[PDB]
Amino acid sequence: ADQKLQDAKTDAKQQITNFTGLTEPQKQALENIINQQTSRANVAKQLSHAKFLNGKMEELKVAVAKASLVRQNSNYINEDVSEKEAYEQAIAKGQEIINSENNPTISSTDINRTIQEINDAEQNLH
């Protein structure tokens, strides 16, 4: 019923508000997506997507936040400039996503690609 759909949207938006991986712009974009759904099945699909995106954003935030530890404890200080530049480029791309205010991507594949670029570059420093 209409009351069932309204309640499912409210629940989903409340869950999204609790997430810590997603940025506030990402939460707002997803809450808007939730509000536009016409069935509870579709609300659940979008909430499942938000939960997965939240996990990837958690992974991305860790990969970016650990950069100073990596610079200090890996071979970064001794490494060739190409490897150091690749790492800083990848970290900067991750920072761009996290700090974005204008319509941040809600594409988990885009996030996963950025995570993988950081992880690949970090691996070459160990």
Numbering used by the authors: 1 to 126
What does the primary publication say about this deposited structure?
Extracellular matrix binding protein (Embp) and its subdomains referred to as the F-repeat and the FG-repeat are critical for adherence of S. epidermidis to surface-immobilized Fn. Embp is a giant 1-MDa surface protein consisting of 10,203 amino acids (aa). High-resolution structure analysis of F- and FG-repeats revealed that both repeats are composed of two tightly connected triple α-helix bundles, exhibiting an elongated but rather rigid structural organization in solution. Both F- and FG-repeat possess Fn-binding capacity via interactions with type III subdomain FN12, involving residues within the C and F β-sheet.
The C-terminal repetitive region (aa 4511 to 9509), also present in S. aureus homolog Ebh, is composed by a row of 40 repeats consisting of 125 aa. This repeating unit is referred to here as the FG-repeat. Similar to the F-repeat, the FG-repeat reveals an elongated shape approximately 70 Å in length and 20 Å in width and height. A- and S-modules are connected by a shared helix α3, lancing through both three-helix bundles (the length of the central helix α3 is about 40 Å). The FG-repeat is characterized by a remarkable strong dipole character. The N-terminal region (A-module), formed by the N terminus of helix α1 and the N terminus of helix α3, is strongly positively charged, whereas the C-terminal region (S-module) formed by the C terminus of helix α6 and the short helix α4, is strongly negatively charged. Consistent with F-repeat analysis, the chemical similarity of each individual amino acid is low between individual FG-repeats, but the prediction of secondary structure features is well conserved. Although the overall amino acid sequence identity with Embp is only 30%, the structural data for the FG-repeat at 1.55-Å resolution reveals high structural homology to EbhA and strict conservation of all major structural key elements. Here, by strong interactions between subsequent FG-repeats, the dipole character of the FG-repeats likely supports the SAXS-deduced, elongated rod-like structure of repetitive FG-repeats. Importantly, the KD for rF-repeat binding to Fn was determined to be approximately 4.0 × 10−6 M, which is substantially higher compared to the KD value obtained for the rFG-repeat, i.e., 1.6 × 10−9 M.
